[PDB]
């Protein structure tokens with residue numbers, strides 16, 4: 001039925017106020033849609049935040065409030081704290097189903113931004129023996145934890161045969177991710193330049209190698 | 213305080229059925245709803261349905277009415293969810309949550325992972341990743357099931373280690389781990405990654421050699 005739409009990512013600093021919205025393809029969100037907000041922190045730790053449009057769940061800080069702002073449901077964090085960096089999902093009770101938004105990733109800048117360290121490794125000889133070739137791109141130490149990864153083989157965009165992981169928080173609270181380009185040894189042998197291109201905060205970092 | 217205790221990890225084959233459970237602590241089970249939520253790797257959250265244990269009223273998502281059967285045992289303060297005819301698409305983490313009037317989940321369980329696979333237990337192939345500070349890595353390719361552990365030099369190299377989440381390539385997992393060390397240190401000081409895969413009792417050490 002409805003599609004519930006949330007911002008995909010927002011950034012703020014400690015002590016600032018940020019508002020997240022949740023809207024429906026049926027038109028306005030009403031009180032009868034009982035908007036709920038929940039928080040997901042790393043390792044599948046979920047906390048109920050807001051229920052029934054505006055009730056804080058037990059033990060939730062006062063800085064979190066829910067309201068309907070016009071046609072939309074909203075979550076306002078007054079005086080955001082570094083620990084509020086998390087993903088926030090709203091859900092709407094519509095037609096006897098709870099329908100979820102896609103989640104907003106909120107960054108609350110707890111430390112300076114950090115650009116990625118990108119390392120590209122070629123296939124090992126022992127794997128080339130099995131007739132397979134995986135190139136590994138590791139991307140660490142970036143903050144905000146949002147990155148896009150692109151592969152090119154002799155300049156042509158690759159959009160077949162690559163897997164990238166979701167950004168994981170490192171213990172120092174920056175983020176890491178890896179991407180794999182897997183090819184047959186034969187196909188590896190047909191191309192010279194391989195590049196892993198990582199864009200973070202409007203700037204691309206690129207690492208390239210040549211088969212030779 | 214309130215606690216929602218979930219059953220553990222499940223591995224099932226296509227066509228099977230599994231029963232998951234959630235046990236309540238810290239409140240009157242019969243006055244609250246138990247909801248079940250599916251989180252698929254990057255498919256967001258989906259609501260499966262909810263049961264009111266006081267009188268076993270249920271609400272189901274239409275999409276899951278053929279897949280799920282919800283029950284609760286009021287003496288045992290346990291809700292169950294049975295999933296039949298498992299396909300690969302049912303692989304997900306499932307949560308049970310406590311709901312009430314106007315909400316579905318103020319307290320959440322910890323999640324139960326379900327993997328539906330046709331694969332057999334397979335040990336990793338471990339490949340060293342040399343360039344030629346320096347970053348070295350190991351690729352742990354083609355293992356089933358999860359997990360594998362990776363240490364570097366039997367645990368002595370603990371700083372500057374990154375082990376990434378596994379991706380699924382075909383029906384086998386691949387993960388890698390990297391360690392960054394001062395350039396003076398290697399190759400003088402040997403660096404070795406140690407990979408253990410308990411399900412196939414595999415333990416393999418791979419020394420990183422300059423290329």
Ligand SMILES: C[C@@H]1O[C@@H](O)[C@H](O)[C@H](O)[C@H]1O[C@H]1O[C@H](CO)[C@@H](O)[C@H](O[C@H]2O[C@H](C)[C@H](O)C[C@H]2O)[C@@H]1O[C@H]1O[C@H](CO)[C@H](O)[C@H](O[C@@H]2O[C@@H](C)[C@H](O[C@H]3O[C@H](CO)[C@@H](O)[C@H](O)[C@@H]3O[C@H]3O[C@H](CO)[C@H](O)[C@H](O)[C@H]3O)[C@@H](O)[C@H]2O)[C@H]1O
Nearest residue numbers: 030032033093245262264267269271311312313314315316
């Ligand atoms: C079924 C169960 O039976 C026993 O076990 C026990 O008595 C339980 O308590 C009982 O549970 C129902 O009743 C509880 C109320 O005491 C309620 O807390 C339960 O809901 C909770 O649990 C479920 C699983 C969800 O997680 C939501 C939780 O809140 C549960 O409620 C559900 O079942 C009852 C059955 O009587 C109702 O159907 C209830 O619906 C609510 O009321 C209706 C009227 C709301 O619909 C309005 O809003 C919609 C969105 O705007 C709109 O599309 C509808 O048309 C309707 O709109 C009305 O206002 C509009 C302007 O806002 C228009 O004017 C329109 O013309 C009006 O009709 C619905 O959204 C719910 O809020 C249902 O949730």
